[PDB]
């Protein structure tokens, strides 16, 4: 849920989540991390991406920049959505897993 | 000369409260203020500049000048505190 109701704070938390997500993506790319921990981190990144969009809605509700129009496909460049999992993306080494491939 | 003044506050919040709680308020001093946002070097003569200027003549007059018979900062490059910025 939105922690802060102020437009300036909402942009800060959005950037923090994007800042936090980037740390997690680096961990998934490392091959030494177990399948379970990789899957868990992959879920955490997807949640943060969904949360990022949720903060954009709060920013949009507060009259801020509609980041969905400015949402460059660079996030889509690493995460490709599965046709049966509309809205879930797999990043990094998660594409190497049996079955996910 | 214009009947104007300018104030810079240390913070925007000081300016905002000073703006919101004094704009279009009557006040005793101003009746109702209208408020809106936004050395010489020793022993060196200094050459006088003629008035209003801001080639040479091919005959010249020579003056009958005859020789005479700590220091401190004068220029900004002499001062280490300004040379650093």
């Amino acid at each position: 849920v939105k922690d802060c109701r102020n437009l300036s704070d909402a942009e800060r938390f959005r950037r923090e989540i994007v800042r936090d997500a980037s740390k997690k993506i680096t961990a998934i790319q490392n091959p030494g991390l177990g399948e379970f921990k990789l899957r868990d981190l992959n879920d955490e990144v997807n949640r943060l991406i969904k949360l990022k969009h949720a903060w954009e809605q709060r920013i949009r509700e507060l009259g801020g920049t509609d980041y969905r129009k400015y949402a460059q496909k660079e996030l889509d460049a690493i995460g490709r959505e599965t046709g049966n999992s509309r809205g879930y993306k797999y990043f990094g080494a998660a594409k190497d897993l049996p079955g996910v491939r | 000369e214009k009947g104007c003044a300018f104030i810079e506050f240390t913070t925007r919040e000081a300016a905002e409260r000073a703006a919101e709680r004094s704009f279009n308020k009557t006040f005793i001093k101003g009746k109702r203020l209208t408020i809106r946002w936004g050395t010489p070097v020793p022993s060196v003569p200094i050459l006088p500049v003629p008035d209003g200027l801001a080639a040479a003549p091919r005959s010249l007059v020579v003056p009958n000048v005859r020789p005479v018979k700590s220091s401190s900062i004068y220029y900004p490059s002499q001062d280490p505190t300004r040379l650093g910025a």
């Binding site: - | 022993s43 050459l47 020579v62 003056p63």
Partner: protein, 945 residues
């Protein structure tokens, strides 16, 4: 702090290197160390200027200052970390994106918006160590005591991002002039993937890349350091192929002349000195000690340039030799060049009567191999250079020449000269970050030349339309080069061959006289030439062939321009221009290193390198221009290297004392090859100063002397107006009780000399010397700031006095000159770095007409290395003797006493500034009235325009 006393665990640039990998690896190490020291000095200076302080109630750095080279990071993020390429450990790309508020100052705003691909910037995270509501910083104290830097990461800049986030690639900036809204911009940045790997192999939960708060940009002459290091790393990894004739002399083994054309078998005995010689008498004078004769069928009454020369001694067959009984023989054949046009084209031609030493350089520069020429001050080194370019371009038009230069200023003088020679303007190309503001009236940038090609193509197609109209050919033949080419081959050539058939099969002996004037088909095309044919078939056939070469040249140009109709994009056009169309490419040594990994990928190919100012180029930056192309085989395709410089003038600037002094990074490759005794040509005649002024420095050079006009021109015969002697060394005593002063480490100053130079410049200005003709120099950077401050206070505020042409250090005035130099030799307790004879020879050679030196005589007169110059200064008084009656110019000869009045001798800075005040004041009405008249006639003459 390195003094030369101790040993350091550093590589050395001694004369010789074991192998090419040794040579590269020493260069890698020392250049990486030096560039790091430069980066340190830049960042510490910038961070003092930004004046960071801790906010009084928050844990964040706030910047109270400003700097041209830095901005606060508004936001930074990493957008991509590409998977490692096959066979590599590091990520392929690490794309940062930085957001900055550029601010409202327009020139700085232009600078940040003109960051380009491969420019280097540093993301910096910093804090103050000390807490105050704004803080002052002292360069007298260590940086790490005052400001804390906790991360620096370098980035390659990629282009600025637009409103949507697309990237403004370089060629859009010439045309996408629609300004991005607001003051915020975004830049995309390539982080180093090895450091990103190193930053994450330690593990992460904290992240260094979140912490940044400044971005810093480097200046236009130090961006190249990562591109130099990238180049060398690649050449260490791959099989580098330096030419077999060249690797030995770079490493310093074998005979040093093995690279010279005397030893190389590939030297050619016959050369077309296209226009190096003005007359046959000049040919004879240019080769003293040779037999010169015309070939059979030529006579000295009609022998005229061009001349082919055959040097018999360069033939390798045993039958031809320096046989006894006759001198070395040069055979001269003049060339009857058959003119390519019927129009009255007066050709662009050389007009420089080269002296024998310059001709020896030009001869050696046309021959293959390594040519070194030493150019003392005023010896025509630029004109030798340009003639080598012109001669190569005419003799071997299939060969492409890359010109590398230290400064952009010398690159300007070069291209100003070349355009006066017979070089076609489309074949010239100039490259560099200065290209937005080239000073030439013709724009030789990649963008400028593309617009020239587009402009000329349109005017040529109008001639194709005019030609088709003369032929009564109906159709869209002028629509494109491609349409024009088929029109030429099918129609213009057919009609031309049908003309030559009538002449040859019948016109030689069974047609009327002058019938060529009737049957020539293109008479309607040359309708703006009257009397094209005289009425003589034996003669008219020649001009008819001259008319054909004019038509044929139009379509030859078009057939080369066809690519600009297929390549419709600015990037692809400049690639075709850069790789195929241009024959002469001009670049700085800085820019050659930056662009290598593009040029190597474009397949850029060149046959000749000409280097100018080569003594000023670093050894690393001199080598890299050799390898801007792939080797096509087991050997490199480079045929010529010409190096032009002067090792007796200043070295490259290396600012770390140890890397300068211990590792010898101040040794340029030019100076090293000279110490290797590689054969080099001394340009031995000077044409650019008084012989009296020239005497002060020409003692350093073997055989250097003056051109005949130096004794002859009135400006060298006449005295400096208002001075009794054309140069002096002026003993400056202590002013206000102080000699030199030194507020910062090695920041020397001398206010007594600075106040004297100001009064002395003012004295000349009262005498009517133009301000553009006087330059004020000093040996130390610290005095140059002080002189600027003095002149900004005491001259610039007065419009009568004005401001000198330049106030500079001697080092930054290397390669420049002026008529009058006032030179301040700051030191008073002990001799400075002026004891380096390379400092002295530069300082004493910047004047043409007068050099007045300010300093303590007793510091310098005792010095052994300065003794030859000082014995000449000792011919004249050590106190300034002036003749204030003589306003500028004077008819008085340089060597005679004045007949009018008597001179006065200026005792010291106090007497100087007191005299100049009275001399200013007494002449002030007449000096004012001149200026009021001069500004009136200025504004009145322009008022009609």
């Amino acid at each position: 702090n390195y003094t030369g006393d101790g040993v350091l665990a550093l590589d050395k640039l001694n004369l010789q290197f074991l192998t090419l990998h040794d040579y590269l690896l020493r260069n890698f190490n020392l250049f990486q160390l030096e560039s790091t020291y430069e980066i340190r000095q830049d960042l510490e200076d910038v961070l003092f200027r930004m004046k960071p302080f801790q906010h009084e109630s928050r844990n964040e750095t706030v910047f109270s200052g400003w700097a041209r080279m830095a901005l606060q990071i508004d936001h930074f993020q990493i957008s991509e970390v590409a998977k490692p390429l096959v066979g590599e450990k590091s990520p392929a790309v690490v794309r940062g994106v930085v957001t900055v508020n550029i601010g409202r100052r327009q020139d700085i705003r232009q600078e940040w918006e003109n960051l380009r691909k491969h420019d280097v910037c540093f993301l910096v995270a910093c804090r103050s160590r000390k807490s105050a509501s704004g803080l002052k910083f002292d360069v007298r104290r260590p940086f790490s005591e005052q400001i804390e830097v906790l991360s620096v990461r370098g980035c390659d800049v990629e282009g600025m991002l637009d409103q949507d986030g697309h990237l403004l690639e370089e060629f859009t900036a010439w045309e996408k002039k629609a300004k991005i809204p607001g003051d915020l911009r975004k830049f995309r940045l390539l982080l180093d993937p090895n450091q990103y790997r190193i930053d994450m192999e330690q593990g992460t939960k904290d992240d260094i890349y979140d912490t940044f708060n400044l971005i810093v940009r480097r200046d236009s002459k130090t961006n190249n350091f990562k591109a130099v290091l990238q180049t060398i790393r690649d050449l260490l990894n791959t099989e580098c192929v330096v030419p077999d004739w060249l690797t030995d002399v770079i490493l310093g083994y074998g005979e040093p002349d093995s690279a010279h054309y005397s030893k190389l078998s590939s030297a050619v005995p016959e050369l077309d000195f296209n226009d190096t010689f003005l007359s046959f008498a000049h040919v004879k004078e240019s080769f003293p000690g040779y037999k010169i004769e015309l070939a059979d069928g030529f006579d000295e009454k009609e022998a005229v340039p061009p001349f082919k020369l055959e040097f018999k001694e360069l033939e390798r067959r045993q039958d031809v030799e320096i046989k006894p009984g006759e001198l070395r023989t040069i055979l001269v054949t003049p060339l009857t060049r058959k003119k390519v046009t019927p129009y009255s084209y007066d050709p662009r031609k050389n007009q420089v009567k080269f002296t024998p030493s310059q001709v020896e350089a030009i001869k050696s520069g046309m021959q293959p191999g390594l040519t070194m020429v030493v150019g003392p001050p005023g010896t025509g080194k630029t004109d030798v250079a340009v003639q080598i370019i012109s001669n190569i371009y005419h003799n071997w038009p299939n060969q492409r020449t890359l010109i590398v230069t230290h400064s952009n200023q010398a690159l300007n003088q070069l291209f100003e000269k070349i355009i006066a020679l017979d070089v076609d303007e489309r074949h010239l190309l100039r490259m560099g970050h200065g290209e937005e503001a080239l000073e030439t009236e013709k724009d030789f940038s990649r963008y400028g030349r593309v617009n020239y090609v587009l402009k000329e193509r349109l005017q040529l197609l109008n001639c194709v339309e005019k030609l088709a109209k003369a032929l009564k050919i109906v159709g869209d033949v002028a629509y494109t080069c491609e349409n024009a080419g088929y029109f030429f081959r099918f129609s213009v050539c057919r009609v031309w061959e049908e003309f030559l058939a009538k002449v040859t099969s019948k016109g030689c002996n069974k047609l009327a006289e002058g019938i060529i004037s009737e049957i020539f088909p293109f008479t309607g095309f040359f309708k703006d030439i009257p009397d094209l044919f005289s009425g003589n078939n034996s003669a008219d056939l020649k001009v008819a062939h001259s008319c054909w070469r004019h038509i044929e040249q139009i379509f030859e140009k078009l057939d080369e321009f066809r690519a600009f109709e297929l390549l419709r994009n600015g990037r692809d056009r400049t690639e075709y221009l850069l790789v195929k169309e241009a024959k002469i490419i001009a670049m700085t040594c800085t820019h050659a290193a930056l662009r290598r990994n593009e040029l190597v990928k474009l397949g850029f190919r060149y046959d000749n390198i000409v280097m100018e100012e080569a003594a000023q180029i670093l050894e690393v930056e001199t080598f890299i221009p050799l390898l801007l192309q792939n080797p096509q085989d087991g050997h490199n395709r480079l045929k010529r290297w010409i190096m032009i410089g002067d090792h007796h003038q200043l070295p490259p600037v290396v600012q770390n004392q140890a890397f300068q002094k211990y590792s010898n990074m101040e040794q340029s490759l030019f100076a090293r090859l000279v110490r290797l005794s590689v054969p080099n040509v001394q340009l031995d005649r000077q044409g650019r100063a008084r012989a009296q002024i020239a005497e002060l420095y020409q003692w350093r050079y073997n055989g250097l002397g003056n051109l005949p006009h130096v004794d002859g021109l009135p400006q060298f015969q006449n005295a400096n107006a208002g001075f009794a002697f054309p140069f002096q060394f002026i003993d400056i005593p202590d002013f206000n009780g102080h000699g030199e002063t030194q507020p910062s480490p090695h920041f020397y100053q001398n206010l007594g000399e600075a106040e004297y130079a100001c009064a002395l410049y003012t004295y000349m200005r009262i005498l009517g010397y133009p301000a553009e003709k006087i330059s004020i120099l000093t040996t130390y950077n610290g005095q140059a700031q002080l002189i600027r401050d003095v002149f900004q206070r005491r001259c610039d505020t007065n419009p009568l006095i004005g401001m000198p042409a330049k106030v500079s250090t001697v080092d930054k005035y290397q390669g420049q000159q002026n008529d009058f130099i006032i030179l301040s030799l700051v030191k008073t307790r002990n001799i400075g770095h002026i004891r380096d004879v390379r400092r002295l020879v530069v300082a004493l050679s910047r004047a043409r007409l007068g050099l007045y030196v300010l300093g303590r005589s007793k510091v310098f007169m005792d010095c052994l290395e300065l003794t030859p110059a000082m014995r000449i200064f000792a011919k004249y008084p050590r106190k300034l003797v002036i003749l204030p009656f003589e306003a500028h110019p004077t008819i008085r000869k340089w060597n005679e006493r004045s007949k009018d009045g008597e001179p006065m001798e200026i005792q010291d800075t106090l007497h100087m500034t007191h005299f100049v005040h009275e001399f200013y004041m007494s002449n002030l009405p007449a000096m004012r009235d001149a200026y009021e008249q001069a500004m009136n006639e200025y504004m009145e003459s322009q008022r009609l325009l």
